[PDB]
Design a protein around this nucleic acid. Structure first.
Ligand SMILES: [Cl-]
Ligand SMILES: [Cl-]
Ligand SMILES: [Cl-]
Ligand SMILES: [Cl-]
Ligand SMILES: [Cl-]
Ligand SMILES: [Mn+2]
Ligand SMILES: [Mn+2]
Ligand SMILES: [Mn+2]
Ligand SMILES: [Mn+2]
Ligand SMILES: [Mn+2]
Ligand SMILES: [Mn+2]
Ligand SMILES: [Mn+2]
Ligand SMILES: [Mn+2]
Ligand SMILES: [Mn+2]
Ligand SMILES: [Mn+2]
Ligand SMILES: [Mn+2]
Ligand SMILES: [Mn+2]
Lengths: 81, 98, 95, 106, 99, 85, 92, 103
DNA sequence: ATCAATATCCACCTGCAGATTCTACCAAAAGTGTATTTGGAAACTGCTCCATCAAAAGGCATGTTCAGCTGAATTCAGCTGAACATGCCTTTTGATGGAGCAGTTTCCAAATACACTTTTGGTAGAATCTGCAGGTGGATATTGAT
DNA sequence: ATCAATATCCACCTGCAGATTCTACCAAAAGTGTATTTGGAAACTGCTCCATCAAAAGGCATGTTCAGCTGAATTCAGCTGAACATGCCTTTTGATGGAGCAGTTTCCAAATACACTTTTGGTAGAATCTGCAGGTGGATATTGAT
């Protein structure tokens, strides 16, 4: 028994915050962060798969992700941009 | 016996994670999540290793950025603790929830 | 003496279909015209790029369709995809 | 005689003109026959969706001519159109009436 | 004996009023001067279509009315009901204009 | 032949800045707001007029068109409907 | 199937002759050139249309550059751009 | 070759072919690929020089993404040019808001 | 801050594996040399649309008074979130095979680009038509003092 | 729990500025008929990708103790909102000269289309190099206590 969003754990969520310069963290932050992360992932993956489906493929490619991220307005360098 | 006062290790960790570039989410839990979510849009999908890697890069950059604006918002309310109302406020002004 | 063209008469036709006793001010019609020109360009550009990623010279109604799914929020997409699919089959079944 | 492609597709929007704009717009070398039809359809659907919601806005405020205020009310009060046009400014459209709760008297 | 509304009451009336209308809220001629002034400090001997000045004003007012919404949220977040420059600065710093 | 333009940002009056705040639903306004608002407005306008004029000159013209402003506003990511957009 | 790599490394060597570059870094640089390439080409593409012209000339490229690049980076880019064009014309 | 004719390392011929085959316009001027290639190379040098300095500052001789990130964000202008761009494996600038430091 | 004792951090050296550099060769861009096109810069000019000017009048900006209620400063007790040691388990990772399926190739049928050649649908003003803006004057609602 | 001072509302009226309808030309769809591609549909392969497997190694989950931070409660000086008098200057209405869009023509400099001819940039095995990750051993920072 376990859920996958919950696999995004507290230690890890604490680390991202720390890179962002966060010093003290309300205990409610963690479930909020999983919510936000899930919308971010859905929005991007949905677009990526739309690229896959258009390319008549059964495999999400790094370019499908890069193109998705680009039209979401989050351009990524380093993976074939 | 010895122990650091609260806030001190927190600052050490900040200096640490701001100095490095490693991914901060464990690879496999994240990979599950990605596949899990993908499966609701098309079934029996496969992923290039790089496709999962780009996604993680994108997410961690996004979230690290979001915590920056969130932390600004907490400080604006004369606090040093981020709270969901801070994240909500940052997302509305970024226009993600407006 | 020079020829400006617009989506007006079509916007007005559709207007009359939907609210048969309602008019439209010229400034409102201008805005509508700017909306059709915008959306046309958004869809066409995404289509242009999809055609490229697949090493194709041609924009097929299929390209327009993927572009539509990408550009439009989900329920608005589904009805648009349907209307598009429907008008195309209706077209092919003729000469 | 000659039958227009619009009528052949069941459309008010001008299929021929949309075909011309596609070739002449540097979008691709060549353009397939169905693409201007599928695109003219989508444009007409969306136009119709905004005009239906705007007409209701005109009627809710007892006017029979749609003005920019009415376009704005339709677009912001509808969550999907709102997002579609979330970074668009509508000249002479104003804003939605909205006063934060915290600001009202006891 | 004289009559007067308690402070805050007229403010609320004005909110309901200006949210009900669409007219421009900056005076036409002063705004035109500002434009001509700024343009000219960038290129001399420029002329303007009337609609070009009207387009600029429309854009500027829509931008400012939008900026005060985000500002007002920032004040409220600080448990205040008075917008302050630090609120605008926070609004613009998110939002990417000062990041 | 010309008249000299200067200090025109002060033509954006306090009454006018107050109305814009009100359409934004703002109830109370600190006295420092008004000059801050002029700061933000002037940058907003310079940035748009600069790009518009780049469009004017590329068209080898001496007249800023409404279309120049619209194209300008568009690449800024502030698309405007209502003027031939 | 092709890349801007060899030019990046050429340019790297004029500027820091004793400095190397990781492959992951080389991608980023390649994604950067592609990006900017596409930004400038697109703005130039639109510029040509607004003027009802069929051709994208170095004039359209430069206006596109003044529009895309922040004020000091723009100036230098415009210089180098003008400089490569005259030097080129003055050959045979 | 046209690159050498322009004094350029960047491939003038290729930049032209990409322009034709990208549907930007019907025809392409002779000078546009030169002017654009010039522009791409300049920007490329600007970043590599700054990144080269970032490498040297940390006692390294090979530029990695961290160095490209340190370079871009610490420069006000490049930062603005790539203000909505994410650099894989670049990290963030060390920056701690004052109010969080101990008394 | 001194007086002291855990922990953290920073430096200098060092050996090694994983990447980076250096070498050795072929289809396909890139360059040439012709032979035509053709866009669009130059050169009149017909004609909107801008800059300016004048002149009168009220809507609105300015400037002042005055006091309500807001922001800021202080205080303080409870309870949330940090630090830290313990104990378990999920993630990492390393090869081993297998097959799913992206990435190329090879054909022809279907579809798209041309080139002229009739045939309408749209557009630009003229000729009408008709919401609604702006102004009253009266019932209804809101707010604030006693 | 009331009246008095205002603000807000909703209807009814009426001429006008702006929307809709009416007509006459031309740019541009549509129609046919050759002249070209191209997007797919089928058959194969090398390559990444999934599925496992199997230990070890950390990294996470748990619980305890207490620090210090957040939220509440009170206080008060002074800033900012409401109201008022004055009168500046914007808004409105109307013409006038002329700058400069914009509409047409005309015609070479520049670009595109073949046809070959060369050169380069990719790809797949060959050969040093740079950090990484560990090791001290020396100060540093942090925290508790005369
Ligand atoms: Cl060969
Ligand atoms: Cl011609
Ligand atoms: Cl009245
Ligand atoms: Cl003249
Ligand atoms: Cl070579
Ligand atoms: Mn000046
Ligand atoms: Mn050229
Ligand atoms: Mn061979
Ligand atoms: Mn006065
Ligand atoms: Mn007082
Ligand atoms: Mn009193
Ligand atoms: Mn208070
Ligand atoms: Mn005070
Ligand atoms: Mn099978
Ligand atoms: Mn007809
Ligand atoms: Mn009225
Ligand atoms: Mn205590």
């Amino acid at each position: 028994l376990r859920d996958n969003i919950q696999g995004i754990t507290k230690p890890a969520i604490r680390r991202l915050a720390r890179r962002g310069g966060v010093k003290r963290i309300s205990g409610l932050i963690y479930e909020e962060t999983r919510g936000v992360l899930k919308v971010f992932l859905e929005n991007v993956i949905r677009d990526a798969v739309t690229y896959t489906e258009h390319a008549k493929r059964k495999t999400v490619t790094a370019m499908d992700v890069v193109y998705a991220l680009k039209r979401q307005g989050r351009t990524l360098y380093g993976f074939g941009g | 016996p010895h122990r650091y006062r609260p806030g001190t290790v927190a600052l050490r960790e900040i200096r640490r994670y701001q100095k490095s570039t490693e991914l901060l989410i464990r690879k496999l839990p994240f990979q599950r999540l990605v596949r899990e979510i993908a499966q609701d849009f098309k079934t029996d999908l496969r992923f290039q290793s790089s496709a999962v890697m780009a996604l993680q890069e994108a997410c961690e950059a996004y979230l690290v950025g979001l915590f920056e604006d969130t932390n600004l918002c907490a400080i604006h309310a004369k606090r040093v603790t981020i709270m969901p109302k801070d994240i909500q406020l940052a997302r509305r002004i970024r226009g993600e929830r407006a | 003496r020079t020829r400006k063209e617009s989506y007006s008469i079509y916007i007005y036709k559709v207007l009359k279909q939907v609210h048969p006793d309602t008019g439209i001010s010229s400034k409102a019609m201008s805005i509508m015209n700017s909306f059709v020109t915008d959306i046309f360009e958004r869809i066409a550009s995404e289509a242009s790029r999809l055609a490229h990623y697949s090493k194709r010279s041609t924009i097929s109604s299929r390209e327009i369709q993927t572009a539509v799914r990408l550009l439009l929020p989900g329920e608005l997409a589904k009805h648009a995809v349907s209307e598009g699919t429907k008008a195309v089959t209706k077209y092919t079944s003729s000469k | 005689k000659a039958k227009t492609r619009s009528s052949r597709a069941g459309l008010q929007f001008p299929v021929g003109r949309v075909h011309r704009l596609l070739r002449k717009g540097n979008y691709s070398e060549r353009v397939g026959a169905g693409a201007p039809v599928y695109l003219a359809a989508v444009l007409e659907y969306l136009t119709a969706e905004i005009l239906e919601l705007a007409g209701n806005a005109a009627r809710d405020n007892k006017k029979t001519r749609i003005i920019p205020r009415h376009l704005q009310l339709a677009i912001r009060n509808d969550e999907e159109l709102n997002k579609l046009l979330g970074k668009v400014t509508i000249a002479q459209g104003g804003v939605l009436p909205n006063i934060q709760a915290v600001l009202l008297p006891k």
